[PDB]
A = this chain, B = another copy of it.
């Protein structure tokens, strides 16, 4: 006898489903020392989340979205890795905790089709204005929580004021010390609402410009006034605030040349170079072994010390720019080392900013233009 909490188009939101999410938030809230608003408000947000997951889920069904066990495993695997364990290592923990593995996979699957559908649809909707990318192209990390008071695409004065009033009021209590994460859980409409509205740390530059402005002067602990956007009013709380170029001429010992046979050549090669008799690049193209530098006058392009054998790296260490080393023995053999020199995003940036916005906007529409009933 699993009651229905709400009907959502071609389906329902089960009383059980509501409980699970409720408990998830409850525990996670506790295991983090976070105040939760009264179970009344809480249920509401949970519902809103469930109803939405339902809508975008059915959507996935219609447009035939399937997730192969092969991909599923990879996902679970990632959750395992994201949590310091191997698939078995996590599968057991789950077993130990009492969970039926398939039941779990099935949950991760639902999460995956929703993630997919949301991404795919927002894609088929994001809009790129003429010359926008080329325009952006041509032209102190922060940690903050976020609260969104939703507003339709083309709202009414009435709607805008309700929203603004609501937002202002929240900004008030925010400043009078009220628990911001509590408020987020109670009024934020963004994805992160249930999670205290935490965005985490990020570059002030990866944030929409509509915020970049106010967060430049932003001091730790500050509440950034209700910023208006296409999705509604935003409220943020400022929670917290050598390579080397070298070239070497190499000699590798084998059958004919012994370690001394070779070292003696390198002594001569070194002697003729310094005397001007021949040049280093010439000598290298004439003697060096390592193809991939040998005919390149011995050049080894730029690189990092580490990729070099321990004997070699240590050689560079005692060399002066332009200086030539004495012969050096390494795992590869004997070689003359000459030290030359020693030197010590934005588009994805845009894409992600455009995506969050659009995704909000989308769900905004979906939730509105959807058949949903809430039973008692």
Contact = CB atoms under 8 A, between A and B. Distances in A.
A375 interface: no
Given A99-B209, A128-B31, A230-B93, A137 B353 contact: no
A24 interface: yes
Most buried by B among A21, A127, A138, A357: A138
A354 interface: yes
Given A24-B132, A98-B353, 15 more contacts: A17-B137, A20-B133, A20-B134, A23-B134, A24-B134, A79-B130, A92-B230, A94-B132, A97-B129, A97-B350, A99-B136, A99-B209, A100-B135, A107-B138, A108-B130
Nearest to A102: B139
Contacts of A154: 89
B135 A27 contact: no
A103 interface: yes
Interface in A94-132: 94-100, 103-104, 106-108, 111, 123, 126-132
Interface of A: 16-17, 19-21, 23-24, 26-28, 30-31, 33, 79, 83, 89-90, 92-100, 103-104, 106-108, 111, 123, 126-139, 154, 205, 208-210, 212, 228-230, 347, 349-351, 353-354, 357
B208 A354 contact: no
A209 B96 contact: yes
A42 to B, nearest CB: 14
10 closest A-B pairs (Cβ-Cβ)?
Answer: A20-B137, A20-B134, A24-B133, A98-B209, A107-B131, A103-B139, A107-B135, A104-B135, A23-B347, A96-B208
Contacts of A99: 132, 135-136, 139, 209
Given A20-B137, A137-B16, A111 B131 contact: yes
Contacts of A208: 96-98
B135 A26 contact: no
User: What secondary structure prevails in chain A residues at the interface with B?
Assistant: helix
Most buried by B among A93, A97, A127: A97
Most buried by B among A104, A108, A137, A212: A137
A92 B137 contact: no
Contacts of A123: 30-31, 33
Nearest to A78: B130
Contacts of A16: 137-138
A114 to B, nearest CB: 12
Nearest to A205: B98
Nearest to A109: B131
A27 B133 contact: yes
A133 B20 CA distance: 6
B138 A17 contact: yes
